[PDB]
Curated annotation (Swiss-Prot), chains A, B:
It comes from the Eukaryota. One of its GO terms (cellular component) is site of double-strand break. ATP 2 binds at residues 326-331. This is Transitional endoplasmic reticulum ATPase. Belongs to the AAA ATPase family. The gene is VCP. ATP 1 binds at residues 52-58, 153, 189. The chain holds residues 196 to 761 of 806 of the full protein. The modification N6-succinyllysine is found at residue 473.
Length: 555, 555
């Protein structure tokens, strides 16, 4: 029991949301004698939600065991899997036992089974359970201490009748650990194990992009199992290989981790992921003027709210970055979030276009909701033009300047204009085609013209992109940028990448030669590799698009 | 019990509808001895409806406890959650007990559960309950006093068989508290609590736009809990921190309220909200001629109905404001409602276009119904052009001058021509593209040409928009407007906003400088800021659109 027990230390990598859950159900359970009636009624509707496997059960077990309670697990498909007439009996038994003990936490796991969407529970026998749960929750009002948590996979699957007020109304999120938190999950899941040095858990966490909770645990599991396999030749003692002699002389190495990290851990979950971006303004060369104009709207108004009130001005929410493709718009919108700690819930052009092509416009209403429950966040809708481009060309050419997605967005953004925590960044590459209504007061107002990087900006961005990689001495990333006068951002980066390719070849080539001669030559990128890469370099976004975007500078 | 009891004072912020409910079920319950047969049969079908959480249960408890009765709560999903054969037994038991006592109110909460739409209750066992309820209601006819209220989330979810006459036929609304009523809800929910001064509940209510009832209660709850948290360092006495010494020295501050107001109260409900607008004709500079022509049709005909009868003229319902984009059309239609107390149920262009793109034309029939139950109201359909614009350009270009939304509107408006309380204001920005049938007698008739603000109008509107904000002395908003001769409304406002931005920077900049020098400079907007803002100012709606709209002046 104690070997795999739970606590506030076992749960790791998700502290922002664990803080909310704790502070919700730790003060009214550790110090409930004040009863909260001196203040307000305590929470009674916690509805932890997240993708299958994120620590939802572990979080509840930690918040229960740590703050002494009477955790009574009511695993979802076990009250609905006990014939007819016994589901209600078991629910009432569990809740009456919970209230019998003064402190209590009732963790209804997989609430989608007990309480699905009401239009999907055709069977009436499965509907009596939902209604009984609703009435029992209503009866929990003013009952001693019956704080009840739920473990729905997604909050939209639960019956809305449960998600009202008095019932579940404290919907907290438990998102996918983006980075630097999944490393913590791996640390807690590996402290009992033996890491055989060279185990850069930081790199393992950085590589995993989508793995949630038990998936990272299974990654570590397969790493340990691969360590065992590599000794299988030494463990091949059919009788008694189980002896500790061939066991304790084992520990996971970097390659053992990698084998499962890349190949044998295909299981993963992909979706809109809230993430505190790692890129910083130091990583963005140039763009000083916009860097200043992007502080007047998201860092200064929040740092001095009183000044924006006495004078009187609704802060301009909804900057609409418009510039040549690949000019740091995404990098800028991630670095701003890095400055002011926030969640960069991005919605790229493919994700927006999938709803117009698939006619699934309702999903948009969830995106903003995901932003509503992840505040303070950013809503970098990238390539708003995509829907109109698919519809045709200039001025649509297949109808008007509207669509089935950016029209719903025009309503959700208006609704979110009340929320004073969520910025709505748009990054249309071609601005003369977006719906004009997304440029009106209240909605997206400010138009920051991310310019084509100027020569100084080219030098700065080339230096920034050549930071994590060796750059050598005579490379001279000063005149190298001067040869480029209209290159559009990424392309310059590509050049650098191309160099790091056109260079690495030589290295690895020499490497194989070092093998033939056996039967590192200037690792840093030399000017020869950069010249060879520039030999095939393209000025993406011809001057036509540059002057077209300048044509939108009139607005 | 008495601590959280209910009465006509506990319910607050919704008095217009509470008045109807009271007057319906207060005279036939407090003085029923006349039996109403001396007059007419009393109401027997109250069907309180509103978004989940608005005081629906509190309103019933107030109207029951205050006017002594026998409130017998029949919470929806508790008669349908008691096996088979006991639902009808419980309903009959409750109603027979209600009639046993002379006075009685039966508050069927969440009627959607007991009585859903008949096409969604596939299970027959859930259909016997609806039919039993219908028959029992029919038997309540001439029964002593069995006034029965319902708490459906939305009246369309209930079976129409219940909404007929003799059965539920007194469908009253309980809408989202718009403003100045939610402040009252907060006051009632905070009187027992301690507001630590500086708690501008007016501002808190003004900020919340969509919060309903229990959501504002939860806002206050989280404010109090945050006040407790801020003392957590002082409340950190694991043994006996519950002592009143560390409690009574607490009270909610402005920042504690704000933390939940902006960040930690994401829960909210958004929909078409009936609201008595706050903008007044004093806030609209210029537009005198239309201000007079907009009194001949909504204030004079209702102030002197007899004159419009003897002479003989159906008052022209359906003004169709047509002018350059952003020229006070919405402001005018809100100020008119502010003058004659009404409900400004607005339907913006995105909300109209969402039905054409989504092919959900039936929803229109609800909008007018929402207007029918919110009379006297206004129906400011903004940007009727939007649907045609999405369909193409001039004269449609993708077919005819019709559509799937403005065609249904052409029928609902004809049906509503009988209702002598609801004005139907249209605000198409481009008028040469709306369906011609919306310009015919009976339907929208009058065409008020909101003109491009003239120089005097520019001065007036600039002065009005610079009212809530400091304006200084030498700013001289007289020649400042003279430099603008074709600016279209909002743009001038934007200039002012731009100034209040281009000014505030300096202030906050000086502020941070005041910090560096430590290791307000002319707060009022100076002419320098206005000049800088005008340096980047655009004449929205070029003269082409002006002369195009003048081309529609021929009609
Ligand atoms: C009668 C009344 C009077 N009345 C007024 O007089 C006007 N008024 N009174 C108060 C404000 C106000 C509004 C804000 F929205 C705000 O922002 C705080 C904030 N917190 N976190 C972030 S995001 C942060 C940065 C990046 C994203 C992730 C983290 N922001 C932020 C900053 C800038 C823009 N958008 C959000 C602060 C404010 F003071 N306006 C109101 C009404 C018209 O009528
Ligand atoms: C044989 C018969 C003879 N016959 C007639 O001879 C003609 N006739 N007899 C009576 C009327 C009449 C009609 C009205 F519609 C009316 O309006 C009252 C009203 N109350 N509230 C508001 S809205 C108010 C303002 C803003 C919105 C929110 C609050 N209005 C209002 C005002 C102006 C326009 N629309 C509604 C008053 C009337 F007298 N016409 C009728 C028939 C053809 O055949
Ligand atoms: N955030 C986390 N921290 C530590 N362990 C986790 C986390 N998330 C998931 N796990 C691991 O995944 C397993 C199952 O957790 P989870 O799937 O969240 O609960 P449930 O299976 O009840 O949904 C546990 O054994 C736990 O060790
Ligand atoms: N300082 C910088 N300025 C501009 N671009 C940069 C900078 N640093 C890196 N980049 C590159 O610019 C690209 C930006 O692409 P992005 O603007 O997101 O494209 P899109 O706007 O089409 O989504 C990135 O792929 C990144 O590699
Ligand atoms: N108009 C209102 N005035 C005062 N309190 C309200 C109002 N609306 C909601 N509430 C609060 O919300 C809680 C639940 O009310 P409500 O949701 O309307 O009833 P029900 O939960 O039966 O639908 C109550 O405790 C009450 O204090
Ligand atoms: N007195 C006034 N006259 C004209 N416009 C004003 C006045 N006062 C404020 N405004 C501004 O004019 C705008 C009106 O926009 P609106 O006509 O609703 O646009 P649309 O017609 O496209 O819906 C508002 O945003 C408001 O800020």
């Amino acid at each position: 029991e104690s070997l795999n027990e739970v606590g506030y230390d076992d749960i790791g990598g998700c502290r922002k949301q664990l803080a909310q859950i704790k502070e919700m159900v730790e003060l009214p359970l550790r110090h409930p004698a004040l009863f909260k009636a001196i203040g307000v009624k305590p929470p009674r509707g916690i509805l932890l939600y997240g993708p299958p496997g994120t620590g939802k059960t572990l979080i509840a077990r930690a918040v229960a065991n740590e703050t002494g309670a009477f955790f009574f697990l009511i695993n979802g498909p076990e009250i609905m899997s006990k014939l007819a007439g016994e589901s209600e009996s078991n629910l009432r038994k569990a809740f009456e036992e919970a209230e019998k003990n003064a402190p209590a936490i009732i963790f209804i796991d997989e609430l989608d089974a007990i309480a699905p969407k009401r239009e999907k529970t055709h069977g009436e026998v499965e509907r009596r359970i939902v209604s009984q749960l609703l009435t029992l929750m209503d009866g929990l009002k003013q009952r001693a201490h019956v704080i009840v948590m739920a473990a729905t996979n997604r909050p939209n699957s639960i019956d809305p009748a449960l998600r009202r007020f008095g019932r579940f109304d404290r919907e907290v999120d438990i998102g996918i650990p983006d980075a630097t938190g999944r490393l913590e999950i791996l640390q807690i899941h590996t402290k009992n194990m033996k890491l055989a040095d060279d185990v850069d858990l930081e790199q393992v966490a950085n590589e995993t992009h989508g793995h949630v909770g038990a998936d990272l645990a299974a990654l570590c599991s397969e790493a340990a199992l691969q360590a065992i396999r590599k000794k299988m030749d030494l463990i091949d003692l059919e009788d008694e290989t189980i002896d500790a002699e061939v066991m304790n002389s084992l520990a996971v190495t970097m390659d053992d981790f990698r084998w499962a990290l890349s190949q044998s851990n295909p299981s993963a979950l992909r979706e809109t992921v809230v993430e505190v971006p790692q890129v910083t303004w130091e990583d963005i060369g140039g763009l000083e003027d916009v860097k200043r104009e992007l502080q007047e709207l998201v860092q200064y108004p929040v740092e001095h709210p009183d000044k924006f009130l006495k004078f009187g001005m609704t802060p301009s929410k909804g900057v609409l970055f418009y510039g040549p493709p690949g000019c740091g718009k995404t990098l800028l919108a991630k670095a701003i979030a890095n400055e002011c700690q926030a969640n960069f819930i991005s919605i790229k052009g493919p994700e927006l276009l999938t709803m117009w092509f698939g006619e699934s416009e309702a999903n948009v209403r969830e995106i903003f909701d995901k932003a509503r429950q992840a505040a303070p966040c950013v809503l970098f809708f990238d390539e708003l033009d995509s829907i109109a481009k698919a519809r045709g060309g200039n001025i649509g050419d297949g109808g008007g300047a509207a669509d089935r997605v950016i029209n719903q967005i025009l309503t959700e953004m208006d609704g979110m204009s009340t929320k004073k925590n969520v910025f709505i960044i748009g990054a249309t590459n071609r601005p003369d085609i977006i719906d004009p209504a997304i440029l009106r007061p209240g909605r997206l107002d400010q138009l920051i013209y991310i310019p084509l990087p100027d020569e100084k900006s080219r030098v700065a961005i080339l230096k920034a992109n050549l930071r994590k990689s060796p750059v050598a001495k005579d490379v001279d990333l000063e005149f190298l940028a001067k040869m480029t006068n209209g290159f559009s951002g990424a392309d310059l980066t590509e050049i650098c990448q191309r160099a790091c390719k056109l260079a690495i070849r030589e290295s690895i080539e020499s490497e194989i030669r070092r093998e033939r001669e056996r039967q590192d030559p200037v690792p840093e990128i030399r000017r020869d590799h950069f010249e060879e890469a520039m030999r095939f370099a393209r000025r993406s976004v011809s001057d036509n698009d540059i002057r077209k975007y300048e044509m939108f500078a009139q607005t």
